[PDB]
C-alpha cells in the first residue's frame, strides 16, 4: 500500500515515471500489486489548481526466504526411532507427514516406534 498525507483542497495523483507521465492512480492512498523487487512511485499533490513538487517514495522488498535444510533421505528399521530436525533458525516451523505427523518445532518430537 502507498500513502499520502491529507491536505485540505487537494486532489492527488500518483505516477510511475518521474517527468510526470504514466499516471497510475488519483486516490490518496492507492495500492501496488505484485512487487518482486524495490520500486518507486511519485506523488504530485494539487490544491486550488497548483501542483506541488513531486515527492517520491521507495517500496523496499524483502528477499526470498531460502529453503529449509533437512537430512538427506534416510532409512530406519522397524522398532527404531525417526528423529527429524532442521539446522536453520526461524520464527516459525511447520512440519507435516505420514500418519498425520504434525509439528511446530526446530526439533520435532521423535517417533519412537517406527513402523510401516
Amino acid at each position: 500500500s502507498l500513502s499520502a498525507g491529507t491536505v485540505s483542497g487537494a486532489s492527488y495523483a500518483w505516477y510511475t515515471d518521474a517527468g510526470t507521465s504514466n499516471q497510475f492512480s488519483t486516490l490518496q492512498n492507492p495500492t501496488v500489486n505484485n512487487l518482486t523487487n524495490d520500486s518507486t512511485f511519485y506523488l504530485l499533490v494539487t490544491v486550488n489548481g497548483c501542483p506541488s513538487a513531486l515527492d517520491s517514495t521507495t517500496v523496499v522488498v524483502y528477499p526470498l526466504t531460502p529453503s529449509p535444510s533437512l537430512p538427506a533421505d534416510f532409512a530406519v528399521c522397524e522398532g527404531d526411532d525417526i528423529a527429524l530436525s532442521t539446522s536453520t533458525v526461524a520464527s516459525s516451523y511447520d512440519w507435516s507427514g505420514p500418519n498425520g505427523f504434525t509439528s511446530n518445532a526446530q526439533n520435532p518430537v521423535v517417533i519412537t516406534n517406527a513402523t510401516g
Binding site: 486532489s11 495523483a13 492512480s25 488519483t26 486516490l27 492507492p30
Partner: peptide, 22 residues
C-alpha cells in the same frame, strides 16, 4: 461553462473465486 473533473479512480475488490460475488 463548468469544467470536466478527473477520473475518480475505478477499481474492484481483488480477484474473485469462480461462482461468488464481488
Amino acid at each position: 461553462i463548468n469544467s470536466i473533473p478527473s477520473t475518480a479512480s475505478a477499481g474492484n475488490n481483488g480477484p474473485v473465486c469462480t461462482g461468488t460475488d464481488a
